[PDB]
Amino acid sequence: TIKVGINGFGRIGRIVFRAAQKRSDIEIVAINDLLDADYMAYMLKYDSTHGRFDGTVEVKDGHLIVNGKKIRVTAERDPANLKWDEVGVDVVAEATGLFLTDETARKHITAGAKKVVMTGPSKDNTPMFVKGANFDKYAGQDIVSNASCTTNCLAPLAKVINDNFGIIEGLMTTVHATTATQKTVDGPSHKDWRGGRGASQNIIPSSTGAAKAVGKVLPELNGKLTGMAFRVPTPNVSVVDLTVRLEKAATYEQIKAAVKAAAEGEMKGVLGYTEDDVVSTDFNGEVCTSVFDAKAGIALNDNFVKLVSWYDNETGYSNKVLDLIAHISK
Amino acid sequence: TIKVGINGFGRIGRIVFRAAQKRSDIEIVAINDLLDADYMAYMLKYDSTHGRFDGTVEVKDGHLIVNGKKIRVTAERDPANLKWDEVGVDVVAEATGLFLTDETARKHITAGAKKVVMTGPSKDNTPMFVKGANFDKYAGQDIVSNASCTTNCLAPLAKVINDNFGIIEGLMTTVHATTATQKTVDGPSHKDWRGGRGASQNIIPSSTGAAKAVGKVLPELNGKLTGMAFRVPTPNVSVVDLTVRLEKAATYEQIKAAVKAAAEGEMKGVLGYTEDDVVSTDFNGEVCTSVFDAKAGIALNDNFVKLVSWYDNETGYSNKVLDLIAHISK
Amino acid sequence: TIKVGINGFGRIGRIVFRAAQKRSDIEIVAINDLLDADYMAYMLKYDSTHGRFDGTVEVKDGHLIVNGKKIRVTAERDPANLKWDEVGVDVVAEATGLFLTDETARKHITAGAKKVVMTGPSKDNTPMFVKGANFDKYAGQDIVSNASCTTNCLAPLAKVINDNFGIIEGLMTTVHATTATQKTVDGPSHKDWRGGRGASQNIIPSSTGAAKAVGKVLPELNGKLTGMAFRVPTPNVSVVDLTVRLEKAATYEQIKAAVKAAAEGEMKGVLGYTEDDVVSTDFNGEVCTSVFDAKAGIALNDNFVKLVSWYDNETGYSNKVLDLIAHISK
Amino acid sequence: TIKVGINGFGRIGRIVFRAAQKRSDIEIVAINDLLDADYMAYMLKYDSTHGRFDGTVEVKDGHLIVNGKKIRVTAERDPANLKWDEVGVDVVAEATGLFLTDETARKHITAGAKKVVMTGPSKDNTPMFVKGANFDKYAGQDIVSNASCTTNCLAPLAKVINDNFGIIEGLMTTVHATTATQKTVDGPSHKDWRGGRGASQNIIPSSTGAAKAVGKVLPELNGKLTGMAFRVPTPNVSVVDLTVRLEKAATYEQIKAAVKAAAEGEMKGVLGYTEDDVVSTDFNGEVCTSVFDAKAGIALNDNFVKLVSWYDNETGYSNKVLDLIAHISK
Ligand SMILES: OC[C@H]1O[C@H](O[C@H]2O[C@H](CO)[C@@H](O)[C@H](O)[C@H]2O)[C@H](O)[C@@H](O)[C@@H]1O
Ligand SMILES: OC[C@H]1O[C@H](O[C@H]2O[C@H](CO)[C@@H](O)[C@H](O)[C@H]2O)[C@H](O)[C@@H](O)[C@@H]1O
Ligand SMILES: OC[C@H]1O[C@H](O[C@H]2O[C@H](CO)[C@@H](O)[C@H](O)[C@H]2O)[C@H](O)[C@@H](O)[C@@H]1O
Ligand SMILES: OC[C@H]1O[C@H](O[C@H]2O[C@H](CO)[C@@H](O)[C@H](O)[C@H]2O)[C@H](O)[C@@H](O)[C@@H]1O
């Protein structure tokens, strides 16, 4: 197995942890964050969104025992001090949100790890990879990024549409669940004033680099897509609303058929396809990073259409972080 | 003053009632619904969304006294039996949702009213009117419709954009507050399965005829716009997200300037314009039916842009119902 | 197995259905409600609160096939016309909310059923039974009631406390999740004005007969307990807050120990006990009808204490409906 | 007028500011917090809970002009450096939550203020005062505390009940709106694990010192009251549920009459009384710190009763902070 250390035990770190338990190719052997082992165990056991942990959790000698396996727990602020080699870590899932450059993340490698996956968009030239879009472009780099949840939804769908019909131009909106960066009542948010406004009370316009980041994982789409977000009062699951103008005429039936073909073929397990009367909670726990909603989309004409795709912004992204870890470890 | 009777005391009937109190051109003299006078008074006095009624409410002899004025209260199922002439009603605000055809609505005129305004889209050829779009096309008809809240947001903005730059084609999404037709927990909704799913828990895709209805109030846009909705867990205020391809190149600055010009001129009081860091609650109580959000929109290029406009789906629409009543009574 | 027919496919009918699938003593063979088979299948498959159905659902020839078993689907308004004998139904779970008297419910027996369990408090002298409190008092009656969800939480806890320390008097509050009887925005609720007010926006005081109904399943407590409710904006899981004056002095530790003893003994599977830092979502899916929260309670002194117990108002109650069906079928 | 400086521009600081505008006895002349003047102006202008500021707000030369009055804006971390004498501040409203002892708060007086009101419970022996309970006990002290919002609700009601009927013992629950200390999704809360759980998803048991603090403002009740809280998914307005055993027999009618008498007399403007079918949003903006809900309460017998009283945890408390400022400045 690939031995993995998780840096940061926020929503992504904890859902990565849960998603890892079912895999045979990877084992989590260590977690680092500014939390006691007892508090870590509590956060793992009980989850408002995803329910009780499926398995056993005990604290012994200041470390965790999960499904009978020992997991080293540390609280180091400085990544260079993590002593990853002491527990034989191969790959670090870097999930704090604080170390999204080569200089910062590389400290994991100084500390004994072989490779690092950032669980957010890199802030420098560190390459990004999105399953279904460009895992095949991985070129042995020791530090990589899995981009963001919204990019993991938009890119696989954009690729299918562009490959079959040619995207001339597109504009995207994500209607996005509330996240940890938001506030329960109007409070300070110096760099994002709207995002400080009470989350349960409001539809809140927000920026997203996702559509543009698609141009990084799919260079053929560079400059052809951009977008924005609205944060709304749900605790999880989000939806992409993609409006595109197409080079080749395609009826809505042709579009449905092309997406369904991908979902059952090349992009199975990444891209999903439904014709059911679904709502966001139907995707709580969804592993596919993009589930096309056939009945929700609408075409104005054969060259101008609005497509709708769901994503569990916690679960899909977290599973694909693990997919990328396995991928770079081949 | 124009004497008005309200049929139906649901959200629109009650907010129409409140909005009328500040006007000098119109007086509400009668309300009909299947509710006691005491229960009517209760629903008027206390409102979760809009706060306490600003004024006095008393029940006397089975009727209402509001701000010292007597208001006849009846509970007739059959519009033909409403005896509107007995209280000198000029115009009926038909707000039950049940009488959206000429045959049904005309019964108000049989009962002694002179004209009728439906507070929803007509279901037959009854003409629709939207302030800012086509009030000037009113041709003395005795029964009319004020269309819907979403159409009142989309049409004024669409007209400004089309008049200045030429809309080749557009697709719209409304991110829309929860309404009375929805359910608190998953329950039966035979004709709209998704709309039966628990409203506080879900983003729910929903249909809307609004974009197409724009083609009815602005014939020049017939066939060029369509759209869809997502219902989200907020109790009021919604937002239009309009993606358009333009005939004439226009920078985002040109677009902002054109909307601001309308908001300060021809469409003052209908179309609004802001550059502030607003969120949906900032429009709770908004009287403009469309408030353009400059900072939230985004252009991909000079001919392809996404525009954002807010509307209080209760208050703006209700004020414009009254505007239409005054308009047809000139 | 006991063959069961469900009348009414609302929240209780559907969660009863799901909870039955794991049992070996009971099989659901028929469902009746004013819903198509296709719509029934949809409501079974997708649940906002409890996630996707664990198993297979198909519609064939206007009936359902669930986990490979055929289930007759009908839409009869009149219980006497249900033809329960045609599918060999032993016991009816009467979950419509409409037939809570002997006269009405007995029509199930005229139609060929042997016994009936109402899934709500009876409205006449039909006896009520609550597991942990008085199943042992069942005396072969053909029509019974499982009381209500709140009574199923309060009664087992009240019995433990009274049996060990003697309840002189108590007053209860339930902080209760939003239910189907409530409204998404302020709307008509002629017989319960507060309960018509928008559910997602409000704390709403509400009546409950639960504390008094305890006096029916535990006659020794008749007249000694009453209470009230507050409905709050959560979609499921509620909590009892019970304030009692005790005859025998008992420290809080003694109280904890007595509840834990019951939870591990006589009342295992009915009454639960936790000392963890739990919140309501931690009980979504809880099968125990009452889970005592040790850390949340507080004693003023050895004879006056406030005790806190959680219940999943859908799941616990539904499992105990099935328990009562098995019990009366012994 | 009394010149007031506000330290901290969180929910209490901002609602204090708004509530001050209508007063003639007090003027706010200065605000200090780690926020730009432009950001301060934004937070003042738009409020999700209380709507748009009623008046004018401009930023000039790095300070604020509000309703035509200049307000000095500073960003000093150290209270001793506040230079309150430079703007002639008489009293400081200390609303940061960080300086709740004599040592810390007194630094405002070193910096030129004459007196200080903490807008939260003191953490040392600094005396607390609650209008309706013990303003009359103020003995000229230069540093005081207005206690907490829950204490301002419980104490006036407790005093009326005790003065008329004698409280032998009581236990209180507050069902309390979400606050700024809570989290939008499950996140770290090292000293309060439950309070880190997602606020919009959960009923969350929480501690409160309020009932015990009543014993500080009303020494006759020392040791006779304690309580707990449940935080629920509403953005504002909370409710006290007080269960008391009484020395003198009192029917519920006697209790209602005694509370109504206080609300119309000695405690007018502090304690309110309603018999209407109210819900929490009906108190959004409520100035009374305790509004008795006659119809919601319930008596088991003449000596054991549960009483219900509403409070806008932002607005009532903030108005009474100002009342205390005026009181100590007499
Ligand atoms: O930080 C000072 C600036 O705050 C706002 O801009 C931030 O917040 C916006 C959302 O409200 C973001 O779109 C923007 O990218 C942030 O920079 C304010 O709009 C600016 O004018 C202030 O300078
Ligand atoms: O009423 C039977 C049909 O119900 C669904 O379709 C309705 O509900 C949809 C939203 O879930 C609407 O979009 C649609 O317009 C309604 O007709 C179901 O999708 C259909 O297959 C059923 O025949
Ligand atoms: O139906 C007319 C009555 O409505 C109210 O009372 C109902 O609603 C209350 C909750 O708001 C319930 O407590 C009460 O049991 C219901 O009867 C109103 O309070 C009454 O005065 C009206 O007569
Ligand atoms: O900080 C370590 C402790 O955390 C919890 O206790 C805190 O959180 C509780 C609410 O979950 C509060 O009631 C309590 O007062 C806090 O101290 C945990 O319950 C403790 O066992 C941990 O030691």
Residue numbers in the entry:
A (entry chain A), B (entry chain A), C (entry chain A), D (entry chain A): 2 to 331
Task: Give the published text.
In this study, the purification, crystallization and cryo­protection of Escherichia coli GAPDH (ecGAPDH) and the three-dimensional structure of trehalose-bound ecGAPDH are described. The GAPDH crystals were cryoprotected with a solution containing 15% of the disaccharide trehalose. The monomer contained 330 residues, one sulfate ion, one trehalose molecule and 171 water molecules. An electron-density map clearly indicated ordered tre­halose molecules bound to the protein. One trehalose molecule bound to ecGAPDH in the S-loop region. The S-loop region of GAPDH without NAD+ bound as a cofactor is very flexible and does not exhibit definite electron density. Despite the absence of NAD+, trehalose stabilized the S-loop of the enzyme. The rotation of GAPDH also induced a conformational change in its active site. This suggests that the binding of trehalose to GAPDH induced a conformational change in its active site to prevent the binding of NAD+, although the NAD+- and trehalose-binding sites differ from one another. Although sucrose and maltose have similar structures to that of trehalose, these sugars did not bind to ecGAPDH and glycerol was not found, even though glycerol has previously been reported to be bound in GAPDH structures.
Under normal cellular conditions, GAPDH primarily has a tetrameric conformation composed of four identical 35 kDa subunits. GAPDH consists of an NAD+-binding domain (residues 2–148 and 312–330), which is composed of α/β dinucleotide-binding folds or Rossmann folds, and a catalytic domain (residues 149–311), which is composed of eight antiparallel β-sheets with an α-helix and several short loops. An important region of GAPDH is the S-loop (residues 178–201), a long, winding region of the enzyme that is known to interact with some proteins.
